[PDB]
Amino acid sequence: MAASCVLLHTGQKMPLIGLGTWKSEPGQVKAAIKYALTVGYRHIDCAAIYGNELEIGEALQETVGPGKAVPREELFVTSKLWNTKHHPEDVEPALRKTLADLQLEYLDLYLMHWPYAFERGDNPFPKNADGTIRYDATHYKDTWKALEALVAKGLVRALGLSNFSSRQIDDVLSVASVRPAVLQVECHPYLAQNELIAHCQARGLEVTAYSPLGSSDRAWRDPNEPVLLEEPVVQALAEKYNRSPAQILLRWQVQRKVICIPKSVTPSRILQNIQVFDFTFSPEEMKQLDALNKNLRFIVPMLTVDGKRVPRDAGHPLYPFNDPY
Ligand SMILES: NC(=O)c1ccc[n+]([C@@H]2O[C@H](COP(=O)([O-])OP(=O)(O)OC[C@H]3O[C@@H](n4cnc5c(N)ncnc54)[C@H](OP(=O)(O)O)[C@@H]3O)[C@@H](O)[C@H]2O)c1
Ligand SMILES: COc1ccc(/C=C2\SC(=O)N(CC(=O)O)C2=O)cc1OCC(=O)O
């Protein structure tokens, strides 16, 4: 293991650096997984919705397990339950499909991808006549209880939440027999999540930062919005430390003890992204980076409806991002 860890409340050690796999396509992801594991990654972040678990599974079967290059117990694998699978009856089949594709016997962590549900079925984006999303009203508290049964079946070691707000977290905690262990949200110097991180610390949830590098090749970017990797302060620190802008972004987080899952398919970047535990920022440098916070969220679900590109879910009563945190 190249990265250091944090201790989850379950007793699990979670490496502070994991490999993100969103947009890592079938035909490239297998190579990315194998390279990452070889250079010391022991944490992979996956999701059914990314459309690549089948291929990730082939890589893990080659590389991980008895008689292979990496012992299964040394590997931390996260997946996520997609929006169409919030019904208590659909939770186990969804997980078992993910286990099958990944060719694993268990996950180390399984997250509820969003608090709100989509219509049950085999369309991951079910749509109305008008082309807007068709929702299902299963409450996330009922989904949570069904996720708990999976821990009892030995299928998942830990559970957590993705894109939940502080109120929704507290709502889950009021009924949780198995406590969420991790919250995964967008986090980087433009969206520091300071209040939500503090909230999680108080309740025993470790935080994972998704899009820790500003997701710079995300679809339909605003040309007027800044590029986090081009941030002058970041470029300045990169110079000073003889490191890449990406390493500065990741160091800032792991110095805060925030787990980061940067995605890359480029072997050199994969390697450099885990090499963030051999330098330290001064208190003044941390302060420079903390000053960049500006409530700039890059990852907002979007849709094409009637010729215009619109927020997918922003109007939903259960949308997480409306509260202050
Ligand atoms: N829970 C959720 O709703 C959710 C949502 C979004 C993301 N996530 C997770 O978080 C992971 C990471 O977030 P993300 O994929 O949105 O974006 P990201 O990790 O912030 O950035 C990925 C982009 O940065 C590039 N990159 C990687 N390393 C670099 C480096 N060292 N220097 C310069 N560029 C570099 C990648 O290019 P190359 O790959 O071409 O090298 C890719 O274009 C995802 O893969 C996914 O696992 C979860
Ligand atoms: C593969 O399915 C997905 C499709 C779209 C998204 C969300 C996106 S994609 C994208 O370019 N952006 C940014 C934006 O719309 O400004 C988003 O907010 C997220 C998806 O997966 C959920 C995830 O990233 O974990």
CATH number for the domain harbouring residue 249: 3.20.20.100
Return all residues near 293 (Cβ < 8 A) that are at least 6 apart. Answer: 189, 190, 191, 192, 194
Which CA distances in Å does 42 have to 14, 31, 277? 9, 15, 15
How many angstroms separate the alpha carbon of residue 299 from the centre of ligand 2?
6
Amino acid type, 111: L
Alpha-carbon dihedral angle through residues 256, 258, 263, 264, given to the nearest 10 degrees = 40
Q: Which residues are annotated as a binding site?
A: 11-22, 45, 162-163, 211, 213, 215-216, 263-266, 269, 272-273
Contact, 163 vs 115, CB < 8 A?
A: yes
SS3 104: coil
Contact, 113 vs 47, CB < 8 A?
A: yes
Q: Which two tokens stand for residue 149?
A: 């049964």
Listed residue (203, 187, 191, 195) closest to 258, CA to CA = 187
- In eight-state DSSP terms, residue 304 is E
SS3 6: strand
**Catalytic residue check, 50:** yes
Number of domains in the chain: 1
Question: What is the distance in angstroms between the CA of the first residue and the CA of the last residue of the chain?
Answer: 34
DSSP per-residue string spanning 206-253: EEEEESTT--TT-SS--TTS--GGG-HHHHHHHHHHT--HHHHHHHHH
How many angstroms separate the alpha carbon of residue 88 from the centre of ligand 1?
31
- Rg (alpha carbons) of the chain, rounded to whole number: 19
Q: Solved by what technique?
A: X-ray
Cβ atoms within 10 A of the Cβ of 302, count? Answer: 15
Alpha-carbon dihedral angle through residues 44, 297, 243, 21, given to the nearest 10 degrees = 20
How many angstroms separate the alpha carbon of residue 67 from the centre of ligand 1?
31
Ligand 1: nearest atom to the Cα of 263: 19
DSSP per-residue string spanning 67-85: TSSB-GGG-EEEEEE-GGG
- In the block, residue with structure tokens 């929006």: 83
Q: Which two tokens stand for residue 35?
A: 């390279």
Cβ atoms within 10 A of the Cβ of 268, count? Answer: 10
Lining ligand 2 with CB less than 6 A are 22, 47, 49-50, 218-220, 298-302
- In the block, residue with structure tokens 């194998």: 34
Domain range holding 210? 1-325
Pairing of strands 76-81, 43-45: parallel
Cβ atoms within 10 A of the Cβ of 201, count? Answer: 12
Q: What does this entry list as its resolution, in Å?
A: 2.0
**What span, in angstroms and rounded, lies between the C-alpha atoms of 44 and 46?**
6
